[PDB]
Design an enzyme around this catalytic site. Structure first.
Site, short mmCIF file in Angstrom:
data_model
loop_
_atom_site.label_atom_id
_atom_site.label_comp_id
_atom_site.label_asym_id
_atom_site.label_seq_id
_atom_site.Cartn_x
_atom_site.Cartn_y
_atom_site.Cartn_z
N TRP A 18 0.76 -1.25 0.00
CA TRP A 18 0.00 0.00 0.00
C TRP A 18 0.78 1.29 0.00
O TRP A 18 1.82 1.41 0.64
CB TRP A 18 -0.96 0.00 1.18
N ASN A 20 0.13 5.88 -0.35
CA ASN A 20 -0.79 7.01 -0.45
C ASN A 20 -0.04 8.34 -0.52
O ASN A 20 0.86 8.51 -1.34
CB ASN A 20 -1.86 7.00 0.66
N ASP A 21 -0.43 9.29 0.33
CA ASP A 21 0.19 10.62 0.37
C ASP A 21 1.65 10.67 -0.11
O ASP A 21 2.52 10.01 0.45
CB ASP A 21 0.13 11.17 1.80
N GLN A 37 3.82 7.63 1.75
CA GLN A 37 3.30 6.92 2.92
C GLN A 37 3.25 5.45 2.51
O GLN A 37 2.67 5.10 1.48
CB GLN A 37 1.91 7.42 3.29
N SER A 82 2.60 11.77 7.01
CA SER A 82 3.00 12.78 6.05
C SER A 82 3.77 14.01 6.53
O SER A 82 3.63 14.43 7.68
CB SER A 82 1.78 13.20 5.25
N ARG A 145 -1.89 17.93 11.77
CA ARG A 145 -0.86 17.27 10.98
C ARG A 145 -0.55 17.83 9.60
O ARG A 145 -1.06 18.87 9.19
CB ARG A 145 -1.22 15.80 10.82
N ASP A 146 0.32 17.12 8.90
CA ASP A 146 0.75 17.44 7.55
C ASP A 146 1.45 18.79 7.31
O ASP A 146 1.05 19.57 6.43
CB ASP A 146 -0.45 17.30 6.61
N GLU A 200 -6.08 18.55 5.37
CA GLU A 200 -4.92 17.69 5.23
C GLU A 200 -3.90 18.11 4.17
O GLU A 200 -4.26 18.62 3.11
CB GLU A 200 -5.38 16.26 4.97
O1 LIG Z 1 -1.11 8.34 5.83
C1 LIG Z 1 -1.39 9.40 6.73
C2 LIG Z 1 -1.81 10.63 5.96
N1 LIG Z 1 -3.11 10.37 5.30
C3 LIG Z 1 -3.83 11.67 5.24
C4 LIG Z 1 -4.22 12.05 3.83
O2 LIG Z 1 -4.95 11.01 3.18
C5 LIG Z 1 -2.88 12.69 5.86
O3 LIG Z 1 -3.59 13.72 6.52
C6 LIG Z 1 -2.15 11.83 6.85
O4 LIG Z 1 -0.99 12.47 7.37
#
Ligand SMILES: OC[C@H]1N[C@H](CO)[C@@H](O)[C@@H]1O
Ligand SMILES: *[C@H]1O[C@H](CO)[C@@H](O[C@@H]2O[C@H](CO)[C@@H](O[C@H]3O[C@H](CO)[C@@H](O)[C@H](O)[C@@H]3O)[C@H](O)[C@H]2NC(C)=O)[C@H](O)[C@H]1NC(C)=O
Ligand SMILES: *[C@@H]1O[C@H](CO)[C@@H](O[C@@H]2O[C@H](CO)[C@@H](O)[C@H](O)[C@H]2NC(C)=O)[C@H](O)[C@H]1NC(C)=O
Length: 537
Positions: A18, A20-21, A37, A82, A145-146, A200
Site C-alpha cells: 500500500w 498514499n500521500d 506513505q 506525512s 498534521r501534515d 490535510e
Molecule cells: O497516511 C497518513 C496521511 N493520510 C492523510 C491524507 O490522506 C494525511 O492527513 C495523513 O498524514
C-alpha cells in the site's frame, strides 16, 4: 494470458503493498527525491506507516531504496505520517513530518540526512527534542498534521503551516522559527474555512505572474501571488490570493473562504488527493505530486496485493489571466514516446467512431484537437449553478446532444462492450455566451462488479468561438490522466476493464452528437515502460 494487468508502465508505484500521500519531494544535489506513505506489511492502510523512498535523475525512471523515515523514537512510535522537505541555507535538507506518539497523538517531528556524502540520502536521523510541535490549546490529538515546506521571510524568520481543525473548522496553523528547531504557534491561522473538517496536507507557495515557471517558496513580491491549498472532504482545493508576511495575512483573490462547493477550484476533479508541490531550481518549474487511490474492492487490492499510484508529476503555474492554475506533465515524459500516428483535417460525422490504429492503446499519450463549426446550434443550458459531476453522470457517452458528446474512447475493448470515454459538450446560455463541459464517463469502463465507476466532470474555461477544444490523455492501464484545454481542467480516472486479462486494448476517437465535428489534429504516441531499478537489501 496476462499477469498483473493493472500495474502501470510509466506511473510511479512501489513494487507491492500500500501507498498514499506523496511525501517530502525535493531536488537535492542533482537528484530528485520522492517519498510516500507506505505500509510495509499489507495492501491496505495499517497501524504502522513508514516513509517509502526512491530516487530519479529525471522524475520518470526511478530507483527504489530502503524506507527512509520510520518510527525509531517515542515521538513517532506508532507511525510516521506525512510531511514536507525544506533545504535550509547551507544546503542541508530538513524533513518535518507528523508522528503518532506512544500516547497516540499527532505531533510534528524534524529529521535530516545523516550522510550528505550519499547521493541518495539513504540514511536519516531524528532530532533529539522531537516532538518539535504539539497540538495547540483547543485541538484534539488527532486533528493536527501534515506540515508544509517552510519559507523564509525577508526578516529572517521561517514560516510553515500544519493542517487540522478547531471545532471542525479546517485550518492552516502557522508557526514561525529562526533556527528551524524552536517553533511558536502564531496567534491566528494563515487561512481557514468553516465546517470543512481536518485540513490535510496543506500547501502554500508563490506563483510568478505572467510567466510559466515556478519560484522558490521563499519568494514574495508585487508581481507574485500565493496559492493556499488544502485537502478536505476527500478532495484537494486551492485558492489564489495575496500574501503579506508583515502581518501573516492571506487575502483571497475572489474574496471567499474555501467552501468545497462548485464555487471553488481543484487541481484535478477526479481521483487526486494529498498533493504536494516542490521547487525544481534546475529547470525553474514547480512540480506537483499527488496520490491516486484505487477504486476497486478492498478484497481486490489484497488479491493483486497492492494499492495506490502516484499521478505522473506535473508542472504547475498560474494562467495568463491569473485566476486559475495550469498543470502539464513534465517534458521528461516525452522521452518515453516511441512511434507516432497522426490525423489532420478529419470530420467525424454524427454518431461515428473512428479507431486509431497501430498505437500501444493500453500505454500511450494521446492529444486531439477539435475544430467546431456551427455553434449557433449549441443546446440551451445556463450553467451558472450546474454541478458538472452531476451532469456527466446524468449525461454519459450514450446521451446524444447537439455539440458533444465528442471525444476519445480509451481503455476500450474491441467490441466496445467495455470503454472509458473522455469527451466534451458545448452549451449556450440565453444571452448567447458559450460554455464547455469536460467528461470522464466511466459508467461503462468495466463490467466487473464492486468497482466504483462514478464519473467525473468539470467546466473548461475557454471560448469555443475563438479557440479549439484540445485534450491530451496519458493512458496507463488502470489510470488515465485527462488534460483538457492545455491543462486548464484536469481529470484523473482509475478504471479496471475485465478484457485486459485476455485481449488487447483499443483506442478510438468519436462523436455521438447530432452536429458534425472535425479533428483539427490528432497526435498519438505509444509509450514505452519506465525503468524501475531496485537497490535495497
Ligand atoms: O497516511 C497518513 C496521511 N493520510 C492523510 C491524507 O490522506 C494525511 O492527513 C495523513 O498524514
Ligand atoms: C452513443 O450513441 C448511442 C446513444 O444511445 C449508444 O447506444 C448504445 O446502444 C443502445 C442504443 O442504440 C443502448 O443499449 C441498450 O442495450 C443494451 C444491451 O447490451 C443494454 O444493456 C442497455 O442498457 C440499453 O438498453 C445504449 O443506449 C447504448 N450503449 C450500449 C451499447 O448499451 C452508443 O453506445 C453510444 N456510443 C458509444 C459507443 O459510446
Ligand atoms: C556514506 O555515503 C557514501 C557514498 O555512497 C558511502 O561510500 C561508498 O561506500 C561503498 C561501500 O559501502 C563503496 O563501495 C563506495 O566506493 C563508497 N563511495 C564513496 C563516495 O566513498 C559511505 O559508505 C556512506 N557511509 C556510511 C555512514 O554508510
Amino acid at each position: 494470458q496476462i499477469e498483473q494487468p493493472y500495474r502501470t508502465g510509466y506511473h510511479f508505484q512501489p513494487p507491492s503493498n500500500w501507498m498514499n500521500d506523496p511525501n517530502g519531494p525535493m531536488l537535492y544535489q542533482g537528484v530528485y527525491h520522492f517519498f510516500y506513505q507506505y505500509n510495509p506489511y499489507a495492501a491496505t492502510f495499517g497501524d504502522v506507516i513508514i516513509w517509502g523512498h526512491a530516487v530519479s535523475y529525471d522524475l520518470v525512471n526511478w530507483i527504489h531504496l530502503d524506507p527512509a523515515i520510520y518510527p525509531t523514537q517515542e515521538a513517532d512510535s506508532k507511525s510516521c505520517w506525512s510531511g514536507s522537505a525544506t533545504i535550509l541555507p547551507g544546503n542541508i535538507p530538513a524533513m518535518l513530518y507528523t508522528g503518532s506518539d506512544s500516547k497516540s497523538r499527532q505531533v510534528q517531528d524534524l529529521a535530516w540526512p545523516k550522510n550528505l556524502s550519499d547521493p541518495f540520502l539513504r540514511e536519516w536521523v531524528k532530532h533529539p527534542k522531537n516532538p518539535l510541535i504539539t497540538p495547540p490549546e483547543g485541538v484534539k490529538d488527532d486533528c493536527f498534521r501534515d506540515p508544509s515546506t517552510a519559507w523564509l521571510g525577508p526578516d529572517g524568520v521561517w514560516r510553515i503551516v500544519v493542517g487540522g481543525d478547531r471545532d471542525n473548522n479546517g485550518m492552516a496553523f502557522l508557526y514561525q522559527s529562526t533556527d528551524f528547531v524552536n517553533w511558536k504557534r502564531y496567534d491566528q491561522p494563515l487561512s481557514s474555512a468553516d465546517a470543512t473538517g481536518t485540513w490535510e496536507c496543506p500547501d502554500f507557495y508563490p506563483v510568478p505572474l505572467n510567466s510559466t515557471n515556478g519560484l522558490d517558496t521563499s519568494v514574495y513580491g508585487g508581481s507574485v501571488r500565493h496559492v493556499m491549498k488544502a485537502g478536505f472532504e476527500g478532495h484537494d482545493w486551492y485558492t489564489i490570493g495575496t500574501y503579506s508576511p508583515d502581518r501573516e495575512n492571506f487575502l483571497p483573490q475572489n474574496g471567499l473562504s474555501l467552501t468545497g462547493s462548485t464555487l471553488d477550484l481543484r487541481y484535478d476533479y477526479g481521483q487526486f488527493y494529498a498533493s504536494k508541490s516542490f521547487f525544481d531550481d534546475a529547470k525553474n518549474r514547480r512540480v506537483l505530486w499527488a496520490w491516486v487511490p484505487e477504486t476497486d474492492s478492498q478484497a481486490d487490492d489484497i488479491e493483486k496485493g497492492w494499492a495506490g499510484l502516484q499521478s505522473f508529476p506535473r508542472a504547475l503555474w498560474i494562467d495568463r489571466n491569473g485566476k486559475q492554475l495550469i498543470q502539464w506533465p513534465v517534458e521528461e515524459i516525452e522521452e518515453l514516446r516511441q512511434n507516432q500516428v497522426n490525423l489532420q483535417n478529419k470530420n467525424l460525422k454524427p454518431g461515428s467512431v473512428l479507431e486509431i490504429h497501430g498505437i500501444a492503446a493500453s500505454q500511450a499519450d494521446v492529444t486531439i484537437s477539435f475544430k467546431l463549426e456551427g455553434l449557433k446550434e449549441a443546446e440551451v443550458l445556463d450553467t451558472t449553478l450546474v454541478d458538472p459531476q452531476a451532469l456527466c453522470n446524468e449525461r454519459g457517452a450514450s446521451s446524444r446532444g447537439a455539440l458533444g458528446p465528442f471525444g476519445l474512447l480509451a481503455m476500450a475493448s474491441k467490441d466496445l462492450k467495455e470503454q472509458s470515454a473522455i469527451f466534451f459538450r458545448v452549451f449556450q446560455n440565453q444571452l448567447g455566451r458559450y460554455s464547455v463541459l469536460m467528461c470522464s464517463d466511466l459508467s461503462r469502463s468495466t463490467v466487473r462488479s464492486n468497482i466504483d465507476t462514478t464519473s467525473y466532470g468539470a467546466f473548461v474555461d475557454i471560448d469555443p468561438r475563438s479557440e479549439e477544444i484540445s485534450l491530451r490523455n496519458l493512458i496507463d492501464h488502470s489510470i488515465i490522466e485527462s488534460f483538457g484545454a492545455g491543462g486548464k481542467t484536469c481529470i484523473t480516472s482509475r478504471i479496471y476493464p475485465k478484457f485486459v486479462n485476455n485481449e488487447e486494448a483499443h483506442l478510438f476517437v468519436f462523436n455521438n452528437g447530432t452536429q458534425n465535428v472535425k479533428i483539427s489534429e490528432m497526435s498519438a504516441w505509444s509509450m514505452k515502460n519506465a525503468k524501475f531499478v531496485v537497490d535495497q537489501s
